[PDB]
Amino acid sequence: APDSVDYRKKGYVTPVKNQGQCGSCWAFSSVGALEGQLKKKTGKLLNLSPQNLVDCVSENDGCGGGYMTNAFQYVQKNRGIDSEDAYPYVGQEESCMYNPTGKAAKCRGYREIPEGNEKALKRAVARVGPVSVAIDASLTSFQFYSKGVYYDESCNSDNLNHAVLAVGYGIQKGNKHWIIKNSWGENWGNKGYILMARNKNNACGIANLASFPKM
Numbered sequence: 674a675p676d677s678v679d680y681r682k683k684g685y686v687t688p689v690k691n692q693g694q695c696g697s698c699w700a701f702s703s704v705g706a707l708e709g710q711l712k713k714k715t716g717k718l719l720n721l722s723p724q725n726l727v728d729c730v731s732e733n734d735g736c737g738g739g740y741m742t743n744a745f746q747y748v749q750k751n752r753g754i755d756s757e758d759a760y761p762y763v764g765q766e767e768s769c770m771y772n773p774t775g776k777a778a779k780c781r782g783y784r785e786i787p788e789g790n791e792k793a794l795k796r797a798v799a800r801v802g803p804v805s806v807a808i809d810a811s812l813t814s815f816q817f818y819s820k821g822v823y824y825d826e827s828c829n830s831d832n833l834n835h836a837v838l839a840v841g842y843g844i845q846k847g848n849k850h851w852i853i854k855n856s857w858g859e860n861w862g863n864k865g866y867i868l869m870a871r872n873k874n875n876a877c878g879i880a881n882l883a884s885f886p887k888m
């Protein structure tokens with residue numbers, strides 16, 4: 674794999690979104706991975722709907738949390754997920770109202786990266802595209818990130834509480850990092866993005882719960 678990859682530059686990443694008050698980070702992480710695969714499969718980049726996921730993935734808890742794998746499974750069993758336009762994000766769990774007519778993509782499975790293996794996560798990003806990842810984002814230093822490659826010794830790799838999207842990797846002034854797309858708006862971090870330390874012993878547990886869908 675190359676030494677630096679940035680899918681934003683390749684048009685595989687949609688604009689940064691904001692989950693609002695609803696803790697649906699898992700839904701945004703899921704749609705972001707699906708949008709990357711859609712782009713790779715059809716050459717078209719579209720906003721997929723996180724709300725379709727928060728309302729319809731019964732195995733998950735809506736705004737109270739969930740997992741990306743359950744979301745991928747639902748998309749595969751449902752044989753589709755709507756575009757954002759066809760199922761607008763409201764920021765609160767409502768009854769499942771999937772509109773088969775607004776379907777924009779589908780899913781045919783997902784793969785999980787070996788737990789804690791950052792080398793394998795790198796290969797995956799290089800070969801498939803944006804990968805959904807889970808991290809510990811509970812530290813004040815994460816909330817107030819600005820500038821540089823984020824690294825904090827308090828980060829706990831067994832305390833995963835946030836779901837984000839790895840859209841690439843590289844090295845900034847000697848520091849290896851993962852380019853991460855968050856879902857807290859463009860106003861947070863560096864225009865909605867954060868660079869996280871790569872190869873610093875699975876910092877914040879970045880390679881502990883990584884997955885991507887198959888199309």
Ligand SMILES: *[C@H](CS(=O)(=O)c1ccccc1)[C@H](CCc1ccccc1)NC(=O)[C@H](CC(C)C)NC(=O)N1CCNCC1
Pocket residue numbers: 695696697698699733734736737738739740741807808810811833834835836882
């Ligand atoms: C999303 C994380 S977040 O942006 O809300 C957040 C805010 C500030 C700091 C850190 C994270 C989401 C939050 C769920 C939640 C809401 C309210 C109170 C407690 C939890 N986290 C998840 O959905 C998370 C995803 C990864 C895979 C760990 N999963 C999750 O929280 N759950 C709990 C319920 N059972 C399923 C998994």
